[PDB]
């Protein structure tokens, strides 16, 4: 929060009645197993059972929708009341603020953006970005309350499980720079351009010229300044040429367009993350970050440990540490590789989905090695070139045999502990 607040100051702004003594809080929690002194509890639904627990823990008060051991600020809707507090704390932040939305890539663009800002600051503390996936109707006001006096910029992820959700949250957020990565199918497009509602008349939009929804959006932006990204089109404001994988596989390209020309080597996989990068770069440009604040910040971004970390062993093996729907994503990642490829899975801890996976793999990867009970079914499904295994050891023995140009991908649940196998080769 930017300053602490005081129950009696809010009955007006929140359309609400104070019950019991006044108080001041500096932070809010919607979760009784994670609250402390100087804090407000928001009873959602059932939070209302746990009023002794939060009191005992030192919350100064509770925000309730129905009416006890601490002061109550009573409202009609506590999801709505939270939304208000967010907007309200957002309106005391006077620094630059970007937000983003799309079907996929919004978190990566968030990370790339934060990285660019933080590098440029350079100071990680000073740029506030959505922790995790708190990007929905509770997530975004909670993230907005994180805003505080040490922050000088902010990056906000906006997801939607429906129509209106983003128009609700984007009102709360009211960003200087909006981003749409990509998009029934017409509901999805309508939903994502709801973000253009929260922009000011001169606020910049950032839009994927390749998307089929490009026009709907261009319309909905209504003359606002507009920055575009493409991996195809020479007219776009932000472009990439000479895409070429490095030896670990991560995507290189020459950035181009209005910000200047430069080489960027990312530490991530897939053509799609080049689009993501162009969008983070467009948004950074908009916030007047110079060409190398951008490049430095993109090149400084490591992936999260255990999620698609591509590395290269001293033996010339290419190895992707990724340790269930994702199994299929992973399979497709691997399927984009040119040599022999090899999928390596421990259990996901009905038995059917392991057969489903096995068959799905077949045709897209040279081989599938696996470990644990359930995975016997997958190896079978996948057919001839599959090898099932009795323990990690015989597996790792088999794997130490593979020639370079071969790409290997490991996956499995945390209780399957396949990190044990990444270590064994790295
Ligand atoms: N531009 C893009 N086009 C297609 N797929 C993409 C994409 N960017 C990311 N993805 C896919 O989506 C997955 C997760 O990326 P990311 O977490 O940024 O998406 P997201 O945050 O938009 C989904 P969520 O709503 O669950 O947070 C990645 O594994 C990747 O394969
Ligand atoms: Mg996300
Ligand atoms: Mg995500």
TrEMBL record:
Residues 101-284 form the Mur ligase central domain. Signal peptide: none annotated. ATP binds at residues 102-108. GO terms for molecular function: ATP binding; metal ion binding; UDP-N-acetylmuramoyl-tripeptide-D-alanyl-D-alanine ligase activity; UDP-N-acetylmuramoylalanyl-D-glutamyl-2,6-diaminopimelate-D-alanyl-D-alanine ligase activity. It catalyses: D-alanyl-D-alanine + UDP-N-acetyl-alpha-D-muramoyl-L-alanyl-gamma-D-glutamyl-meso-2,6-diaminopimelate + ATP = UDP-N-acetyl-alpha-D-muramoyl-L-alanyl-gamma-D-glutamyl-meso-2,6-diaminopimeloyl-D-alanyl-D-alanine + ADP + phosphate + H(+). Residues 314-414 form the Mur ligase C-terminal domain. GO terms for biological process: cell division; cell wall organization; peptidoglycan biosynthetic process; regulation of cell shape. It is found in: Cytoplasm. Mg(2+) binds at residues 107, 133, 157. One of its GO terms (cellular component) is cytoplasm. Its main location: cytoplasm. Its EC number is 6.3.2.10. Keywords: ATP-binding, Cell cycle, Cell division, Cell shape, Cell wall biogenesis/degradation, Cytoplasm, Ligase, Metal-binding, Nucleotide-binding, Peptidoglycan synthesis. Residues 26-86 form the Mur ligase N-terminal catalytic domain. It holds the Pfam family Mur_ligase_M. Belongs to the MurCDEF family. MurF subfamily. HAMAP family: MurF (MF_02019). This is UDP-N-acetylmuramoyl-tripeptide--D-alanyl-D-alanine ligase.
């Amino acid at each position: 929060m930017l300053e602490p607040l005081r129950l009696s100051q809010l009955t007006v702004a929140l359309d609400a009645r104070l019950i019991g003594e006044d108080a001041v809080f500096s932070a809010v929690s919607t979760d009784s197993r994670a609250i402390g002194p100087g804090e407000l509890f928001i009873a959602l639904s059932d939070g209302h059972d746990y009023l002794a627990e939060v009191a005992a823990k030192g919350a100064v008060a509770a925000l309730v929708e129905r009416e006890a051991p601490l002061p109550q600020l009573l409202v009609r809707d506590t999801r709505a009341a939270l939304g208000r507090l967010g907007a309200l704390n957002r309106r005391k932040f006077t620094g630059p603020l970007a937000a983003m939305t799309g079907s996929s890539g919004k978190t990566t663009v968030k990370e790339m953006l934060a990285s660019i800002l933080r590098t440029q600051a350079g100071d990680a503390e000073s740029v506030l970005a959505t922790r995790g996936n708190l990007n929905n109707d509770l997530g975004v006001p909670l993230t907005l309350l994180q805003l505080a006096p040490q922050h000088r910029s902010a990056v906000i992820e906006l997801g939607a499980s429906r129509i209106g959700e983003i128009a609700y949250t984007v009102e709360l957020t009211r960003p200087h720079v909006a981003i749409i990565t990509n998009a029934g199918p017409e509901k999805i497009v309508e939903a994502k351009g709801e973000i253009l509602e929260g922009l000011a008349a001169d606020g910049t939009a950032v839009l994927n010229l390749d998307d089929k929804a490009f026009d709907t959006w261009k319309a909905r932006a209504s003359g606002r300044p507009l920055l575009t990204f493409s991996l195809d089109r020479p007219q776009a404001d932000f472009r990439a040429a000479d895409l070429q994988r490095d030896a670990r596989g991560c995507m290189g390209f020459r950035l181009q367009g209005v910000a200047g020309e430069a080489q960027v080597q990312l530490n991530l996989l897939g053509r799609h993350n080049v689009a993501n990068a162009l969008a983070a770069a467009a948004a950074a440009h908009a916030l007047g970050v110079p060409l190398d604040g951008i490049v430095a910040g993109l090149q400084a971004l490591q992936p999260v440990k255990g999620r698609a970390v591509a590395q290269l062993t001293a033996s010339g093996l290419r190895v992707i540490d990724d340790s269930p729907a994702s199994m299929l994503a992973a399979i497709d990642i691997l399927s984009g590789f040119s040599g022999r490829t090899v999928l390596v899975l421990g259990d996901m801890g009905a038995e059917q989905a392991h057969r489903e996976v096995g068959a799905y793999a077949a045709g897209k990867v040279s081989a599938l090695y696996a470990v644990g009970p359930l995975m016997a079914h997958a190896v079978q499904a996948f057919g001839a070139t599959g090898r099932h295994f009795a323990d990690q050891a015989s597996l790792i023995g088999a794997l130490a045999t593979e020639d370079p140009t071969t790409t290997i991908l490991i996956k499995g649940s945390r209780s399957a502990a396949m990190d044990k196998v990444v270590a064994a080769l790295c």
